[PDB]
Design an enzyme around this catalytic site. Structure first.
Site, PDB file in Angstrom:
ATOM      1  N   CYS B 117      24.707  53.488  39.598  1.00  0.00           N
ATOM      2  CA  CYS B 117      26.145  53.369  39.306  1.00  0.00           C
ATOM      3  C   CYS B 117      26.782  54.918  39.800  1.00  0.00           C
ATOM      4  CB  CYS B 117      26.270  53.177  37.874  1.00  0.00           C
ATOM      5  SG  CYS B 117      28.012  53.594  37.090  1.00  0.00           S
ATOM      6  N   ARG B 120      28.996  57.313  36.999  1.00  0.00           N
ATOM      7  CA  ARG B 120      28.497  57.833  35.686  1.00  0.00           C
ATOM      8  C   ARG B 120      28.850  59.263  35.181  1.00  0.00           C
ATOM      9  NH1 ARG B 120      22.430  57.756  37.074  1.00  0.00           N
ATOM     10  NH2 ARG B 120      23.310  57.606  39.191  1.00  0.00           N
ATOM     11  N   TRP B 289      36.399  50.509  35.171  1.00  0.00           N
ATOM     12  CA  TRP B 289      37.493  50.100  35.819  1.00  0.00           C
ATOM     13  C   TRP B 289      37.233  50.349  37.385  1.00  0.00           C
ATOM     14  CZ3 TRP B 289      37.805  54.497  32.468  1.00  0.00           C
ATOM     15  CH2 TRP B 289      37.182  55.781  32.972  1.00  0.00           C
ATOM     16  N   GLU B 294      35.269  47.888  46.050  1.00  0.00           N
ATOM     17  CA  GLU B 294      34.732  46.788  45.331  1.00  0.00           C
ATOM     18  C   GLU B 294      35.672  45.496  45.639  1.00  0.00           C
ATOM     19  OE1 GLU B 294      32.589  47.370  41.645  1.00  0.00           O
ATOM     20  OE2 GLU B 294      33.768  48.872  41.255  1.00  0.00           O
TER      21      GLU B 294
END
Ligand code: HEM
Ligand code: HEM
Ligand SMILES: CCOc1ccc(-c2ccc3c(C)cc(N)nc3c2)cc1CN
Ligand SMILES: CCOc1ccc(-c2ccc3c(C)cc(N)nc3c2)cc1CN
Ligand SMILES: C[C@H](O)[C@H](O)[C@H]1CNc2nc(N)[nH]c(=O)c2N1
Ligand SMILES: C[C@H](O)[C@H](O)[C@H]1CNc2nc(N)[nH]c(=O)c2N1
Ligand SMILES: [Zn+2]
Lengths: 418, 420
Positions: B117, B120, B289, B294
């Site tokens: 991720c 983070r 969010w 993406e």
């Protein structure tokens, strides 16, 4: 133990059986993956570590075993004789010499096993230049000019490698001190900045330190620094007429030419170490042809390099106030368009990163089908731009170290006894 | 054993000592790196693998030791009694219950340990909704609606996670069958073409089989499919007024709106498994969010997704007759420019991949300093476009697995015993 790799864009599934033949280590464990470390210990070969008679024969046997299997002569009289022969020479001389055929198999297969190399579909078509008779830096210089000329071929580039005498006792190493045969000079500036290529600032200084007379321009081709038989290295300038260069213009932006950019056509790495059946070839410069992104994304736009993004974006009149306009990205794209266009127009061999990744996927499919696998480092195969719109992105890869191999080795000035 | 990582753009060198406190495997060995395999065996949790009291208390004690250290109570009376309390409860009831504070620490740290991720840096600011009293699909639907409403927050998005009852014997699992709470449908047409999101074709068919009246448009929000306590899943329609969407236009290209594109604001992943001190939470939707890429790169441009590249390039009038023109690259930048523009224009929280990676580098450095490490999967941290002009590219990373942690788990339709 019989591993599967999947493509998530095509659902193709390959079974890997070849990793079982893996000899060296990856720097990873069950507890921690280091697949993103640039230069782990296992991928580097320190020159203090000379081979002993006992370590050397198993390494020689394993190489000869695959060699003779490739030529369908495994277990045959010829194979046996050779093993016997090599065994004898080792027992007597504490080393041995490769036959020409083996040397060629060795080189080609070192490339084939280069897990970080995307251009390996071409692995069998390599031109091997035996320079194990070389004895001096002048002699080295001559071999290197000839490699450069054979390879450049008036723009129609051809893969090649020139192999100098193998290591003996670490005291008589052949070494090319340049990291590439052809690279632009980098000069520290009194006003603070950096002129030319920052990645070469140290070398360019060692060149001056050894008596180079620099034009102190921005695209000054560096002189060769050649070390024969463990001796001190010598400066030779490559003949200008053998260094092919491509002025960088854009097909739509006529102001592009004004930036004054150019690059050289011949990517030729010289600082690595070729290892075959335990033998260490510390000078083995090799070359093929660029992938567009290597010059355009990395050499031009990386911070620790030419870093022209801000300057290009400026001429494009993009909104550089906020990062979310993706001006860096837009610029980056035009720059690579220009590099591809300049090279193609000059009819100098280059491949775009879409074509080359597609080629690699084919190669993978070929290797899995005829070899039972293909070691591959995803962190290095995926191009530095447009990553996920190329097919290598969705392709699972297995990384492992086969032999023969190219390996890293310390920079000579750290180790060279003067 | 100390370990070093180098950044090759700034020559920063950090030392990792946190990898020593690692338990789970990676999938690698000395002889093979599997760092690019997408779902390794050790990153997954099959529901048949239900834990005995045997290994449960070692895992319990490890987590409790972690917790009380963070709150500076290691070896305290409260720490010892809690161990004893959890001990009795396990040998008595073959499992145990997390306290509220413990559950919160756990979920936050699973995020913090999520090596894949990039976001983070926000890990400490996570809204944890304890849905452990939930007993039905309708109860789930309500918690989930409240999660969406809170997290969306009129476009000013907040990190949240909702946590449904832990697994027991693996026969009474809570599962959210959707990969994400909000996702568009996908319909395999007769001619081979797909309408909507190709990604969701299979799940759509299940919904359709379960009795979902499918409107069959290119941007239909899927029904929630919810399983409580090992029961057969049930169909719920998310109320449209709760689903925030953003029509996609381009700040210079007027024909882009006429591509008919839009996307949902709230990325909320629901199919993962939250592991805390040996307990497995098979339903634990979490949301944050979007990073722009993406949607722009993966959701719109992947060949196995909406795949609009050719139509965008066509309308840009690019030279699509050979890759060398980089028309594919050129269109991709436009589409991501468009996604960022549309979102920001609507004051819906989004982050570009330059800002996000720069943030992560800062986070990571901070984590090395005050934690002794930060596990990170380079292969996943590096953005799917413009990789090397972000600072994570030249950053070496260590990947290893800490607990608490988010794990993968098999699709429920594959493992579910149906009742009827
Ligand atoms: C023929 C066209 C070729 C292309 C397009 C090509 C392309 C590439 C690229 C893009 C990289 C990644 C380096 C970077 O991006 O910084 C690479 C690495 C590499 N290539 Fe290839 N290459 C070619 C030929 C060759 C040849 C002829 C050899 C050897 C004789 C070779 C061996 C290697 C090795 C050893 C590495 C680095 C491996 C490592 O560091 O472990 N390549 N190549
Ligand atoms: C708030 C802003 C956030 C951003 C921008 C963000 C960004 C990302 C991105 C880009 C990925 C890679 C996914 C892909 O591209 O395929 C990812 C993975 C992931 N993120 Fe985050 N995220 C955020 C919040 C969160 C939250 C709230 C959680 C959990 C509470 C979380 C946990 C995870 C996990 C578990 C993965 C995948 C790890 C794996 O598959 O092993 N993230 N994130
Ligand atoms: C920091 C040192 O890392 C490298 C190692 C090897 C190569 C490399 C080595 C050989 C190449 C060849 C032979 C062709 C080509 N187009 N690119 C090549 C690139 C580049 C790099 C530069 N990233
Ligand atoms: C095959 C499954 O792979 C994934 C794994 C995790 C995620 C993921 C998981 C959580 C996220 C969160 C919480 C926020 C965000 N912006 N993106 C996220 C993305 C996406 C994907 C989809 N590539
Ligand atoms: C094969 C490889 O593991 C796979 O394509 C990965 C690569 N990196 C990724 N990185 C992110 N953020 N998201 C992804 O879906 C993927 N896919
Ligand atoms: C730390 C990281 O491994 C390093 O930046 C790598 C990433 N991938 C790369 N990939 C290629 N082709 N060339 C490189 O120099 C690098 N650098
Ligand atoms: Zn690994």
């Amino acid at each position: 133990r019989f591993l599967k790799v999947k493509n998530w864009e095509t659902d193709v599934v390959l079974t890997d059986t070849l990793h079982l033949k893996s000899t060296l280590e990856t720097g990873c464990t069950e507890h921690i993956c280091m697949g993103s470390i640039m230069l782990p210990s296992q991928h580097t070969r320190k020159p203090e570590d000379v081979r002993t008679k006992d370590q050397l024969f198993p390494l020689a046997k394993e190489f000869l075993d695959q060699y003779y299997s490739s030529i369908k002569r495994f277990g045959s009289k010829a194979h046996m004789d050779r093993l016997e022969e090599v065994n004898k020479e080792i027992e007597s001389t504490s080393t041995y010499q490769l036959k020409d055929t083996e040397l060629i198999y060795g080189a080609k297969h070192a490339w084939r096993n280069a897990s970080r190399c995307v251009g390996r579909i071409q692995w069998s078509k390599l031109q091997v230049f035996d320079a194990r008779d070389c004895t001096t830096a002048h002699g080295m210089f001559n071999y290197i000019c000839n490699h450069v000329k054979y390879a450049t071929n008036k723009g129609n580039l051809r893969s090649a490698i020139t192999i100098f005498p193998q290591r003996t006792d670490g005291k008589h190493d052949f070494r090319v001190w340049n990291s590439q045969l052809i690279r632009y000079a980098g000069y520290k500036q009194p006003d603070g900045s950096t002129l030319g290529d920052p990645a070469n600032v140290q070398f360019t200084e060692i060149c001056i330190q050894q008596g180079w007379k620099a034009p102190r321009g921005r695209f000054d081709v560096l002189p060769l620094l050649l070390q024969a038989n463990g001796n001190d290295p010598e400066l030779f300038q490559i003949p200008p007429e053998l260094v092919l260069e491509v002025p960088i213009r854009h097909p739509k932006f006529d102001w592009f030419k004004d930036l004054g950019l150019k690059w050289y056509g011949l990517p030729a790495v010289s600082n690595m170490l070729l290892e075959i059946g335990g033998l260490e070839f510390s000078a083995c410069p090799f070359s093929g042809w660029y992938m567009g992104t290597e010059i355009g994304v990395r050499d031009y736009c990386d911070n620790s390099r030419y870093n022209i993004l801000e300057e290009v974006a400026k001429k494009m009149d993009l909104d550089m106030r906020k990062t979310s306009s993706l001006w860096k990205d837009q610029a980056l794209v035009e720059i690579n368009i220009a590099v591809l266009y300049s090279f193609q127009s000059d009819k100098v061999t280059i491949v775009d990163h879409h074509s080359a990744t597609e080629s690699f996927i084919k190669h993978m499919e070929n290797e899995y089908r005829c070899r039972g696998g293909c070691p591959a480092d995803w962190v290095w195969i995926v191009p530095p731009m447009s990553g996920s719109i190329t097919p290598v992105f969705h392709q699972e890869m297995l990384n492992y170290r086969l032999t023969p191999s190219f390996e890293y080795q310390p920079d000579p000035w750290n180790t060279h006894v003067w």
